[PDB]
């Protein structure tokens, strides 16, 4: 019930990107597109979070070489900070 | 990659100071080995600036620090620097030494021997700089430390003599102690060096006697910082020690000229010295009073011997830390019977104590602790 | 006892750490610690001051008995 | 108020030695004045600057 | 008993109960003792780091995990003195066979 | 800003690389970008720029770090912060 509730809140109506990449048709699948999603009836979320910065380390010497990552805020996509 | 880690003079800092293992564990009280440092290098630097301005000969000591205490800027502030310096670092040499007895980090061998050799060291040069203000308690407790160094029978007179520079107390006694307390504190700083360095051989210690390999947190930024606290705070309590009451652990009775006929009804070393001054005054015994101060020193290098226990700090150990606080008070009751005259009852209690101390020191910690041990079903 | 890289063969252990300047420098300084300090000193004093009111009892005892047998003018 | 000091006196190592050097001189002079105003202030009376004033 | 009663309120007073500690954490390192430290079990020495881990990190905070933490009186798993006695046995062994 | 455009021009090729650049390019754009616009915003920044947005991202911050495995040679976090910024050593 929980996985059904979760299929039908998330992958549903706004947030959808159908792609098709080469020596093909716009219209056409545009056409067919609109044949096979018709009657999607699909009509709060995607909020900013805290960047806190702290420190974890797992000491366990059974391992055969060290794997260390530091990492600081970064921008995101809508900036030339980003470029 | 670093000038740090390669140049070798910082690879000698780094593996000092920078990247030194230390543990995440110790309180204020494992500040002290770098208050005693600190107040070292005080002492040097104040010490190097009253002998720039002193001259050292009978007549000229008394009034060569008359001159330093009202002509020169400042320098009665740094004259009241270096004695209460001395009596801070005496403190902290005390609160170091409690601190190595009391959480057992005196399992260690080379470092407590040369810890010992510290303190012999450090005893003899602050009596040699006592006995540079020339003052009347000063000339008589000079006649007192040299006379039980004649103390010692076939030996005693010539080696006296041959240390005094004459059969009397000479303007070349003051000279000589002018020079090796002039001297001293550069072999001390060079036997701490010496200590540092067989301690970063063997590596640092944790209230609770566990070792503490897993929780090696290097000494900069933390330990720095928490010896800067500490220092401030001690130079603090040093500046209100000289400059709000000067004399209350500087005794009055020392801003006399040395007259040699002048036998004033008190006398004792600086309070300090005050428990190395009653034991000999316990047991009326000459050779055996000398021989009872070389022995509560020897006893106290003898320590490691003593340790039978499987635990290392007394920190898990209830019974026989209380007996160590029973040591405690008793060390602070043979300085309130040196802060009190010589008196046939309070040699009574005197030698109660000091017999009490060696009954504590010698007998009843291994035997205590030992029951200790077989109590905890071992 | 040497530096680091050798000392101890460990696993199995996770250790969680905070930048400082997220945190408060004294939380519940007046209302935690004040408690935490009171609990230690209440342990250990009735153990490690008993020793001093003997020092303060021979104190005022031998004081005493000094003065009595030193003022029988 | 907060930022703004970041902005100008935390940024680079000189700058933060230069404001805290000149924080130190106008301390002196703040320092000295209030130390001694206070300090001759508690002892007013039989101070040598009342005898100075008369003589 | 009298001096079982005194062993059980000496383990009250002791303290490391308090600390989350046990039979096999307070011992001090001569060289046999590191050496019976070397011959132990791995699940055994794991907790016993973590167990030293704890009580490091606790003892700098000098907080004190609450009443239903502690380690109880005789729910002890004890589990050193076993290695310790046979390196002893071997070690005294070893010293007896010079002396002879 | 030469690896940078020999990167993104060797990867829009092939089938996957070029589709999934339409994916998530139309995740949160709301279009797609061409090669011709990351080119022009390649071409917009000099030194000065780059040294603005490394005193703006990167001095003396309040990282995260990760450490796994037999690390016991990585010095406490105050050290990296302050190593972190240059006080010119
Ligand atoms: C090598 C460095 C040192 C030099 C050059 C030095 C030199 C002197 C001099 C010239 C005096 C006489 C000043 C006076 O009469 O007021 C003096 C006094 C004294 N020094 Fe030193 N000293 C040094 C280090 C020390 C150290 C390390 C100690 C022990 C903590 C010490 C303990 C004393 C004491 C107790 C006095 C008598 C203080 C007083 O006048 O009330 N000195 N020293
Ligand atoms: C001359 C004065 C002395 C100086 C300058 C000095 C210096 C130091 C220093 C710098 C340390 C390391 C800091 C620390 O405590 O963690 C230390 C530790 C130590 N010192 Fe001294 N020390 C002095 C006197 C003594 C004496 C008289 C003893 C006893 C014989 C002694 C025994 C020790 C011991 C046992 C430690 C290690 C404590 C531990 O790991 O728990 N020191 N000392």
Same mark, same amino acid.
């Given at each position: 019930a929980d996985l059904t509730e979760y299929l039908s809140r998330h992958y549903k109506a706004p947030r959808m990107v159908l792609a098709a990449a080469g020596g093909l048709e716009h219209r056409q699948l545009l056409d067919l597109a609109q044949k096979h999603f018709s009657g999607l009836s699909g009509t709060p979320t995607l909020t900013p979070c805290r960047f806190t910065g702290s420190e974890i380390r797992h000491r366990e010497d059974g391992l055969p070489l060290a794997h260390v990552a530091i990492a600081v805020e970064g921008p995101g996509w809508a900036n030339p900070d980003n470029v | 990659i670093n000038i740090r880690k390669t140049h070798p003079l910082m690879k000698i800092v780094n593996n000092a100071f920078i990247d030194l293992p230390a543990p995440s564990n110790i309180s204020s009280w494992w500040n002290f080995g770098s208050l005693l440092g600190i107040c070292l290098i005080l002492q040097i630097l104040t010490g190097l600036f009253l002998a720039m301005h002193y001259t050292p000969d009978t007549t000229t000591a008394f009034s060569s620090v008359t001159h330093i205490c009202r002509d020169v800027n400042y320098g009665w502030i740094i004259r009241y620097m270096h004695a209460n310096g001395a009596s801070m670092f005496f403190i902290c040499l005390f609160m170091h030494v409690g601190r190595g007895l009391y959480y057992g980090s005196?399992?260690?061998?080379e470092t407590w021997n040369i810890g010992v050799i510290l303190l012999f060291a450090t005893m003899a040069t602050a009596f040699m700089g006592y006995v540079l203000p020339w003052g009347q308690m000063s000339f008589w407790g000079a006649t007192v430390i040299t006379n039980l160094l004649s103390?010692?029978?076939?030996?005693g007179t010539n080696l006296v003599e041959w240390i005094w520079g004459g059969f009397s107390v000479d303007k070349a006694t003051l000279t000589r102690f002018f020079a090796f307390h002039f001297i001293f504190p550069f072999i001390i700083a060079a036997l701490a060096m010496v200590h540092l360095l067989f301690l970063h051989e063997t590596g640092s210690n944790n209230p609770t006697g566990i070792p503490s390999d897993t929780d090696k947190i290097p000494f900069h930024p933390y330990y720095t910082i928490k010896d800067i606290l500490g220092a401030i705070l001690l130079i603090l309590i040093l500046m209100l020690l000289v400059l709000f009451?000067? +004399?209350?652990?500087?005794?009055? +009775? =020392?801003?006399?000229?040395? =007259?040699?006929?002048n036998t004033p009804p008190h006398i004792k070393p600086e309070w300090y010295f005050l428990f190395a001054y009653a034991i000999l005054r316990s047991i009326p015994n000459k050779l055996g009073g000398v021989l009872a101060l070389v022995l509560s020193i020897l006893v106290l290098v003898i320590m490691?011997?003593?340790?039978?226990?499987?635990?290392?700090?007394?920190?898990?150990?209830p019974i026989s830390q209380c007996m160590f606080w029973i040591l405690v008070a008793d060390l602070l009751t043979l300085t309130w019977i040196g802060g009190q005259p010589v008196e046939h009852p309070y040699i009574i209690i005197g030698q109660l104590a000091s017999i009490m101390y060696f009954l504590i020191i010698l007998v009843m910690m291994p035997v205590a602790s030992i029951i200790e041990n077989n109590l905890l079903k071992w | 006892g040497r530096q680091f890289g050798h000392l101890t063969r460990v696993r199995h252990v996770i250790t969680y750490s905070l930048?400082?300047?997220?945190?408060?420098?004294?939380?519940?300084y007046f209302s935690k610690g004040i408690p935490n300090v009171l609990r230690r000193t209440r342990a250990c004093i009735l153990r490690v001051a008993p020793p001093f009111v003997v020092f303060y009892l021979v104190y005022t005892w031998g004081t005493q008995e000094f003065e009595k047998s030193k003022r029988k003018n | 108020l907060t930022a703004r000091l970041y902005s100008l006196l935390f940024r680079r190592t000189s700058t933060f030695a230069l404001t805290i050097v000149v924080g130190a001189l106008f301390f002196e002079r703040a320092f000295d004045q209030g130390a001694d105003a206070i300090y001759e202030h508690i002892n007013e009376?039989?101070?040598?600057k009342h005898i100075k004033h008369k003589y | 008993k009298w001096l079982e009663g005194i062993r059980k309120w000496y383990y009250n007073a002791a303290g490391f109960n308090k600390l989350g500690?046990?039979?096999?954490?307070t011992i001090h390192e001569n060289d046999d003792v590191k050496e019976a430290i070397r011959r132990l079990p791995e699940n055994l020495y794991n907790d016993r780091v973590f167990r030293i881990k704890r009580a490091l990190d606790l003892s700098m905070r000098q907080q004190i995990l609450p009443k239903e933490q502690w380690t109880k009186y005789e729910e002890d798993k004890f589990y050193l003195e076993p290695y310790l006695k046979e390196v002893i046995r071997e070690r005294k062994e070893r010293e007896e066979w010079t002396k002879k | 800003k030469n690896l940078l455009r020999n990167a993104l021009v060797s990867h829009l090729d092939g089938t996957t690389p070029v589709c999934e650049d339409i994916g998530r390019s139309l995740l949160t754009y709301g279009r797609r970008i061409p090669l011709a616009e990351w080119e022009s915003r390649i071409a917009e920044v000099d030194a000065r720029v780059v040294r603005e947005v490394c005193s703006k991202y990167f001095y003396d911050q309040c990282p995260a770090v990760a450490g796994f495995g037999?690390?016991?040679?990585?010095?406490?976090?105050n050290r990296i912060r302050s190593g972190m910024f240059w006080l010119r050593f």
């Open positions: - | 005196y399992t260690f061998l103390a010692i029978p076939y030996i009451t000067p +004399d209350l652990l500087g005794d009055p +009775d =020392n801003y006399t000229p040395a =007259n040699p006929l490691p011997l003593l340790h039978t226990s499987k635990q290392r700090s007394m920190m898990f150990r | 930048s400082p300047f997220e945190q408060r420098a004294f939380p519940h | 009376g039989k101070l040598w | 500690l046990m039979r096999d954490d | 037999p690390i016991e040679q990585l010095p406490d976090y």
